[PDB]
Amino acid sequence: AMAGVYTYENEFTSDIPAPKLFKAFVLDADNLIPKIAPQAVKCAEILEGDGGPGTIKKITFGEGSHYGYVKHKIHSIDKVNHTYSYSLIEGDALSENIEKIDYETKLVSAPHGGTIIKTTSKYHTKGDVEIKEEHVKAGKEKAAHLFKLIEGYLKDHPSEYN
């Protein structure tokens, strides 16, 4: 049975400077996200580990989830370089034919003072590979919205994540 890896890059941009964002979005996601999108994210909970490399998180969704949750395994976190890698491993985007999805995200400092969020997504496939543009671009939008909500919030809370 054919094993393979579908790979998809995209970027977003943001006014928020890289480090604030990293603290908010990566480092306190568990807390900050449910606060600002309770429609779409009920809860977030660490099943195992500190929360560094090797941790397993269950994230629990509200409306607009096929399965109503995911689990993530954190592969790495680099606070100094502002990068993050993990793997979706059980739940929402997966199936018999998509064993796993890997994300790696690099925040980079744009011109001038702002940020560029670079994400690379890696679909570990089994068997024939059908991966619909929809399911993928639908995903882009979800994340794009979510980052927009973070910008907005953080701009309304400048005493935070400094």
Residue numbers in the entry: -1 to 160
Lines quoted from the article behind this entry:
The refined model contains six molecules of Fra a 1E in the asymmetric unit. None of these molecules contained catechin inside the cavity. However, a molecule of catechin was found at the surface of molecule F between two Fra a 1E subunits in adjacent asymmetric units. The nature of the interaction suggests that this catechin molecule has been captured as a consequence of the crystallization process. As expected, the six molecules in crystal form B show a very similar structure, which is also similar to that of crystal form A. However, a high degree of conformational variation is observed in the loop regions L3, L5, and L7. In particular loop L5, shows a distinct conformation in every of the six molecules found in the asymmetric unit. These conformations range from a “closed” conformation, represented by molecule C, in which loop L5 is folded over the central cavity of the protein and approaches the C-terminal α-helix (colored green in Fig. 3b), to an “open” conformation represented by molecule F, in which loop L5 is at a maximal distance from the C-terminal α-helix (colored orange in Fig. 3b). Molecule C in crystal form B of Fra a 1E, is the one that more closely resembles the Fra a 3 catechin complex with loop L5 approaching helix α3. However, in this case, loop L3 adopts an open conformation, and the bend in helix α3 is not present.
Fra a proteins are members of the pathogenesis-related 10 family and are required for the normal accumulation of flavonoids and the development of color in strawberry fruits. PR-10 proteins belong to the START superfamily. These proteins adopt a helix-grip fold with an internal cavity capable of binding hydrophobic ligands. The data presented here demonstrates that Fra a proteins bind natural flavonoids, providing for the first time mechanistic insight on the function of these proteins in the control of flavonoid biosynthesis.
